[PDB]
RNA sequence: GCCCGGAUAGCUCAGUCGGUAGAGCAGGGGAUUGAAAAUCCCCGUGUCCUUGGUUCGAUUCCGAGUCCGGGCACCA
RNA sequence: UUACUGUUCCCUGGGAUUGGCUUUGGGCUUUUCCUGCGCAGCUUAGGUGGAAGGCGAAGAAGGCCCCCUUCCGGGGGGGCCCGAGCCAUCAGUGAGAUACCACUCUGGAAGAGCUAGAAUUCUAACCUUGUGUCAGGACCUACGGGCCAAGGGACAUUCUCAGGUAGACAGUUUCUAUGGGGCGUAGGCCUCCCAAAAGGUAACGGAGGCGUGCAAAGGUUUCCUCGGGCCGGACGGAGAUUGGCCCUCGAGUGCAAAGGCAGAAGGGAGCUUGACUGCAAGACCCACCCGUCGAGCAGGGACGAAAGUCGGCCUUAGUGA
RNA sequence: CAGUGCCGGAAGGUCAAGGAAGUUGGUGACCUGAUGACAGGGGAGCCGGCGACCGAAGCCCCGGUGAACGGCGGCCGUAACUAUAACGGUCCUAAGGUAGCGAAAUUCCUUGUCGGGUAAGUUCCGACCCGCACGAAAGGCGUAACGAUCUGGGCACUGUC
RNA sequence: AACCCAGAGCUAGCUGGUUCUCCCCGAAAUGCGUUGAGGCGCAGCAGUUGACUGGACAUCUAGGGGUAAAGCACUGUUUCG
RNA sequence: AUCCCGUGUGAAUCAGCAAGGACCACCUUGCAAGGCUAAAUACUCCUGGGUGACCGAUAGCGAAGUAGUACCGUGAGGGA
RNA sequence: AGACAACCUGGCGAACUGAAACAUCUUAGUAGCCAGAGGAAAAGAAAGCAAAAGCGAUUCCCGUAGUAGCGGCGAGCGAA
C-alpha cells in the first residue's frame, strides 16, 4: 500500500556473467514508505562479489 | 482451418457460356466441376 | 497481472500537421419585470500532471515518474 | 435455489457438404500523378544520387478565363489566345535548382489487383411435396423404386470446432461452540487478573489490545532533564512565550497493558547505513512442527581522538507450514 | 416498469474459435576472437513463442410490458370545552393500499368494547376499527340452489343423564 | 422412486459378540493438534529387552519469589472532620 | 516424444523417409500406410489314470432317497 | 443359421469404495451386457531396441524394482 517492498541492487554489478571467482548480482531487500520519501532510496551496503561496500540503488 | 479454394484443371468438350469454345483448357472450383459439368458430359477432368 | 484513454479556468471537456491557450455552466454588473423568471448582453481566473530530451522556440512530439478513468485475463 | 462443477435442449460465429454470374464496398497495391509556410532569400528550401545539360513546333514565356485544393501566401490544371523564351556554379544555404531523371515518403486521385463483409440474382448440389406417370405373374390412391413436373436453393439440414445459454438434468458440498433453537456473535497472536510467592494451568470467568509503524522513531559520538505546585511579567485569560523558588521521578517511551528506564532506554545536536556477507560454543522453551538468547571467528565497513559500540528498533503483539 | 422476467431496438463499449501484417527466439553452412581447456557473432532451411488489425450471438446500453416475478412508507403540527383531524409542513421511495371488507379459516395483547340470544354464554349472530400482519384473477365483495361439510340456536323426541 | 439377480463377503471412526489353565508385573481417564469433540497422531503414565549409572527415604544449609497475613509509600476507592 | 482415432488441410521415393522422450544439426538404427503363420502361456461343463497331515450325514456339492424335486412366487427368481 | 462351464478376443461400459468429506484421481477399463471364434485365443517376422559397445519376430516365468518416474506431488499408480 503506502508501505512497500523495495529491492536494492548493486549499481556496479555486471549481469554479463563476470570472469572472477564468485559471480552474481547483489540485491538486498527492505521496506520504504512510498509517500514519506518519494526519492529513490540510495544506500551504501556490502556486496559479496565486489567484496567492498558499494552503492545499492533501486529497481522499478 | 483456412478455407482453401479447390482448383480442378479441366478440358471443355462443348461450348458453354462464360467458359468458352469446345476443346478448351481451364481451371474450376470442385463443386462446379463435379455437380454440374461432369454429369452432363460437358467437361473432362485432366491429369495427363 | 496485461490492454487502452485521460490530468487544460471554480466545475464539465474542445484542441493547429509546434508560433494566440479555448468553449459551456458556476460567479460579478445592467436592465429586463410595479416585483419574479425567461429575455438578454458584458467582465474575472491558467506553471495545459511531474520531470528531462527534441526544437529557432512546445499544451502539441518523445523518454522516465505519479495519479485517474475503463477493458480482458488466471488452478499457491 | 442468484451454493459449486458440469451436461443437455436451444441461439450464434469458423471449417466441411458447396456451385455460377453480377453488384456494392471496408483494408493492402500496380503503372503512374498530386504534395512540404527553420531563418539568412531571386522564396510555402523534399531528403538522397546521374548532374552542364534540358523543355519547344507531336507548338513555351506573357495576358483572357473554366475547375479544384487552401495555412485566400499561393499552388496543380482543361480551352483559347500568344510566338522564340522559362535558363546552371551564378552569392545565400547542414542539404540545388521549377533545366532534366530514378526507387519513393506526408495525404488525394484513378482505371487495374488480394480478401472479406454485404445485398441481388441464377440452377446443377441439397431440401420439400405430387390420387403426376411408368413398372415385374399381378398390384403399389399399400410404404417404397425409376422418370417427369412443381416449390424452394447454395440458404437450410447433417457433421466438426468455438462462444453464449434452462435446477431441464447429474454428481456433490453446506465447520465447530453458542441457549446442545432461530439469530448474530466467537475460532489466530499479545498484556493483565483469576493462578494457591518456581514454571505450567480451566471456565460462555473479569479487563484490554494486534494483523503495524519509523530512511529515522536505526547506528554511533556528545551534550541535556522532565512533570507539578507557588510568584513576577504588555495584550495573555485556568491555559502560549519568559524569569525565579519549593517537591524529586509523580512526565515521557509511535500504539494496549504489564515489567523496565533520571546526568538514564527520556529531550537535542553532529556524522552515518551493522535495517551487513560468511557463520557459530553453549543455553532456554519444548508432543511434533515451530520459537527465543548468544559469547566467539573471518571478511568488508560506520561513528569515534581512542578505549570501544554497532547483525534494526526499552522488552513482550504486528502473522501463516 | 426502479429490481426481476419477457418482448422489441440498433449507434457505441465488451466480445471466442479462427484468420493475419508483422516482429521475436532455438538450431546452423560459415566468419572472427582467445595464455583456456574453449568462446562470440551468423545465411538458407526446419522448429517455436508473441502478435497490431478483421472477428457473431450474448452482456453493458435504449424502449415497451402486471389477469408477468412481485411491491404498495414514515415523522411532525393544526379547528370557540375536552377531545379527535377534513387541512398544512417535512422525510423517503419505483410507487406509497383505491373500491369493497374488517377481532375474520387472517386479531398478538384478547374472554377487545357495545348490542342481542341464555337464569348464567372464552363459542354464536349484528356492529365499532385501535387491520400485531385484509385487499382486488396466488382474484375482491355479494349470492338463489346444493353439501354423509364446518359452526350457533329452537320445536318434536328420547335411559345421553 | 417397484421387484429379482449381480458388482457384494459393498461401506458402518457405530452397537453387539470374541471359547482351555496356572505364574509374574501392571496402568490411565492428563497436555497439544485435529471438519475435532463418543475417533485419531505425539507426549505423559504399562510390559518386556539392553547400555550406562547412584541413588532414593531421611537431615541441614543456600537461592530467587511477592501468595497468606499485614499496610497506606503509590494506584483507585471511602467516611467524617 | 512414441502409439491410435473425429473434423479440416495434406507431402516425399532411397541424392528419399521414420525412429532415437519438445525442437535443430550430426551420426546410429530401421524401411509404415497388403496379408498369414506352430510351440512355450490361460482354463475345467468334462474323460482316463493317480495321490490326499480332505469331509463323513448341522460336514462334503444346493442335492449319499422324487433335488433343482416338494413347496413358495404372475414372473424373473427363491429352494428344503 | 442353433447349443456351448471357465479361459480368450472385440464392442459398450458403471457404482458403491479409497482419498478418513469431495469434484481431478481411485475403484477399473473391473463387473455386467452384447457379438465372435478356438482348443487355446491374441500377439508376431523390426518404418524395433540400444548407445558409440552391441542385439536380432511374438508370447510366458525369474529378476531389474516397489528402482526411474507419474500424482489435488494427496490417496495412490508404477515402467523399461
Ligand atoms: Mg477445400
Ligand atoms: Mg454452424
Ligand atoms: Mg460454405
Ligand atoms: Mg428447381
Ligand atoms: Mg406411389
Ligand atoms: Mg413416385
Ligand atoms: Mg427459384
Ligand atoms: Mg450453410
Ligand atoms: Mg458448448
Ligand atoms: Mg441437484
Ligand atoms: Mg449452472
Ligand atoms: Mg505455586
Ligand atoms: Mg507461579
Ligand atoms: Mg482462561
Ligand atoms: Mg537518531
Ligand atoms: Mg501566565
Ligand atoms: Mg500506553
Ligand atoms: Mg509503565
Ligand atoms: Mg538517548
Ligand atoms: Mg569480540
Ligand atoms: Mg558479536
Ligand atoms: Mg569485524
Ligand atoms: Mg577514522
Ligand atoms: Mg532509540
Ligand atoms: Mg418494475
Ligand atoms: Mg422492466
Ligand atoms: Mg424500462
Ligand atoms: Mg434483449
Ligand atoms: Mg451497435
Ligand atoms: Mg477485440
Ligand atoms: Mg487469435
Ligand atoms: Mg507471420
Ligand atoms: Mg535467431
Ligand atoms: Mg559456436
Ligand atoms: Mg549461435
Ligand atoms: Mg472487432
Ligand atoms: Mg456484438
Ligand atoms: Mg422512457
Ligand atoms: Mg392488479
Ligand atoms: Mg383547544
Ligand atoms: Mg399535502
Ligand atoms: Mg398531509
Ligand atoms: Mg410544499
Ligand atoms: Mg427518489
Ligand atoms: Mg417510476
Ligand atoms: Mg411519480
Ligand atoms: Mg378504505
Ligand atoms: Mg372515493
Ligand atoms: Mg360494512
Ligand atoms: Mg370475541
Ligand atoms: Mg376471505
Ligand atoms: Mg391481518
Ligand atoms: Mg385469541
Ligand atoms: Mg342480554
Ligand atoms: Mg356479550
Ligand atoms: Mg358449546
Ligand atoms: Mg362477528
Ligand atoms: Mg398486506
Ligand atoms: Mg389473501
Ligand atoms: Mg395478484
Ligand atoms: Mg376463491
Ligand atoms: Mg350462500
Ligand atoms: Mg357430492
Ligand atoms: Mg308437530
Ligand atoms: Mg339403560
Ligand atoms: Mg413419479
Ligand atoms: Mg429402494
Ligand atoms: Mg466392489
Ligand atoms: Mg464388509
Ligand atoms: Mg453384509
Ligand atoms: Mg459412505
Ligand atoms: Mg503387585
Ligand atoms: Mg486422576
Ligand atoms: Mg465419532
Ligand atoms: Mg497413543
Ligand atoms: Mg515403563
Ligand atoms: Mg527472600
Ligand atoms: Mg525464602
Ligand atoms: Mg515487594
Ligand atoms: Mg500476582
Ligand atoms: Mg489479603
Ligand atoms: Mg492511601
Ligand atoms: Mg487515601
Ligand atoms: Mg516408433
Ligand atoms: Mg523407446
Ligand atoms: Mg512423428
Ligand atoms: Mg482410439
Ligand atoms: Mg511420393
Ligand atoms: Mg530403427
Ligand atoms: Mg514400404
Ligand atoms: Mg505409423
Ligand atoms: Mg508389414
Ligand atoms: Mg493375426
Ligand atoms: Mg439329520
Ligand atoms: Mg447336507
Ligand atoms: Mg450322527
Ligand atoms: Mg454360431
Ligand atoms: Mg446367438
Ligand atoms: Mg466350441
Ligand atoms: Mg466416485
Ligand atoms: Mg460418491
Ligand atoms: Mg471417501
Ligand atoms: Mg471415509
Ligand atoms: Mg498349447
Ligand atoms: Mg491365431
Ligand atoms: Mg526373420
Ligand atoms: Mg518383413
Ligand atoms: Zn556488486
Curated annotation (Swiss-Prot), chain A:
GO BP field: translation
UniProt main location, coarse: plastid
UniProt xrefs under SUPFAM superfamilies: Zn-binding ribosomal proteins
GO MF annotation terms: structural constituent of ribosome
Reported function: Component of the chloroplast ribosome (chloro-ribosome), a dedicated translation machinery responsible for the synthesis of chloroplast genome-encoded proteins, including proteins of the transcription and translation machinery and components of the photosynthetic apparatus.
Subunit structure: Component of the chloroplast large ribosomal subunit (LSU). Mature 70S chloroplast ribosomes of higher plants consist of a small (30S) and a large (50S) subunit. The 30S small subunit contains 1 molecule of ribosomal RNA (16S rRNA) and 24 different proteins. The 50S large subunit contains 3 rRNA molecules (23S, 5S and 4.5S rRNA) and 33 different proteins.
Membrane spanning residue stretches: none
InterPro entries cross-referenced by the UniProt entry: Ribosomal_bL33, Ribosomal_bL33_CS, Ribosomal_bL33_sf, Ribosomal_zn-bd
Family assignment from sequence similarity: Belongs to the bacterial ribosomal protein bL33 family.
GO CC annotation, single: ribonucleoprotein complex
Subcellular location: Plastid, Chloroplast
Record-linked HAMAP family: Ribosomal_bL33
Keyword field: Chloroplast, Plastid, Ribonucleoprotein, Ribosomal protein
Database matches in Gene3D superfamilies: Ribosomal protein L33 (2.20.28.120)
Protein name in the entry: Large ribosomal subunit protein bL33c
UniProtKB/Swiss-Prot annotation, chain B:
Domain of life: Eukaryota
Localization of this protein: Plastid, Chloroplast
Secretion signal span: none
Function: Component of the chloroplast ribosome (chloro-ribosome), a dedicated translation machinery responsible for the synthesis of chloroplast genome-encoded proteins, including proteins of the transcription and translation machinery and components of the photosynthetic apparatus.
Family to which the UniProt record says this protein belongs: Belongs to the bacterial ribosomal protein bL9 family.
Subunit structure: Component of the chloroplast large ribosomal subunit (LSU). Mature 70S chloroplast ribosomes of higher plants consist of a small (30S) and a large (50S) subunit. The 30S small subunit contains 1 molecule of ribosomal RNA (16S rRNA) and 24 different proteins. The 50S large subunit contains 3 rRNA molecules (23S, 5S and 4.5S rRNA) and 33 different proteins.
Protein name: Large ribosomal subunit protein bL9c
Annotated source species: Spinacia oleracea
Amino acid at each position: 500500500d503506502v508501505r512497500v517492498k523495495v529491492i536494492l541492487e548493486c549499481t556496479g554489478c555486471v549481469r554479463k556473467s563476470v570472469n572472477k571467482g564468485s559471480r552474481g548480482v547483489s540485491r538486498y531487500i527492505t521496506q520504504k514508505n512510498r509517500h514519506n520519501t518519494p526519492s529513490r532510496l540510495e544506500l551504501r551496503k556490502f556486496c559479496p562479489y565486489c567484496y567492498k561496500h558499494t552503492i545499492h540503488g533501486e529497481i522499478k | 482451418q483456412k478455407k482453401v479454394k479447390k482448383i480442378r484443371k479441366i478440358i471443355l468438350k462443348e461450348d458453354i457460356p462464360d467458359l468458352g469454345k469446345k476443346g478448351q483448357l481451364l481451371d474450376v472450383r470442385a463443386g462446379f466441376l463435379r455437380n454440374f459439368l461432369l454429369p452432363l458430359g460437358k467437361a473432362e477432368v485432366v491429369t495427363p
